[PDB]
């Protein structure tokens, strides 16, 4: 029931236009996970949406 938030396990510096940079501990709602291993995510810190590498996060 409800949503599953994700938390960053490691800092990450984006290297492409639509990717988010984030810190360890930053939390996300996942907007789309049906395109492959990069997920469209919405940061609970910044309010921004962009891609994150899914291996950098774990379910909260």
UniProtKB/Swiss-Prot annotation:
Family: Belongs to the protein kinase superfamily. Tyr protein kinase family. SRC subfamily.
Quaternary organization: Interacts (via its SH3 domain) with PIK3R1 and PRMT8. Interacts with FYB1, PAG1, and SH2D1A. Interacts with CD79A (tyrosine-phosphorylated form); the interaction increases FYN activity. Interacts (via SH2 domain) with CSF1R (tyrosine phosphorylated). Interacts with TOM1L1 (phosphorylated form). Interacts with KDR (tyrosine phosphorylated). Interacts (via SH3 domain) with KLHL2 (via N-terminus). Interacts with SH2D1A and SLAMF1. Interacts with ITCH; the interaction phosphorylates ITCH and negatively regulates its activity. Interacts with FASLG. Interacts with RUNX3. Interacts with KIT.
Role according to the record: Non-receptor tyrosine-protein kinase that plays a role in many biological processes including regulation of cell growth and survival, cell adhesion, integrin-mediated signaling, cytoskeletal remodeling, cell motility, immune response and axon guidance. Inactive FYN is phosphorylated on its C-terminal tail within the catalytic domain. Following activation by PKA, the protein subsequently associates with PTK2/FAK1, allowing PTK2/FAK1 phosphorylation, activation and targeting to focal adhesions.
Localization: Cytoplasm; Nucleus; Cell membrane; Perikaryon
Gene: FYN
Protein name per the record: Tyrosine-protein kinase Fyn
Record PTM: Phosphorylated at tyrosine residues, which can be enhanced by NTN1.
Annotated source species: Homo sapiens (Human)
Domain SH3: 2-60
Lineage, highest ranks first: Eukaryota, Metazoa, Chordata, Craniata, Vertebrata
Tissue: Isoform 1 is highly expressed in the brain. Isoform 2 is expressed in cells of hemopoietic lineages, especially T-lymphocytes.
């Amino acid at each position: 029931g409800g949503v599953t938030l994700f938390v960053a396990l490691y800092d990450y510096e984006a290297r492409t236009e639509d990717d988010l940079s984030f810190h360890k501990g930053e939390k996300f709602q996942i907007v789309n996970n049906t395109e492959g291993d990069w997920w469209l995510a919405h940061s609970l810190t910044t309010g921004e949406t962009g891609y994150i590498p899914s291996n950098y996060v774990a379910p909260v």
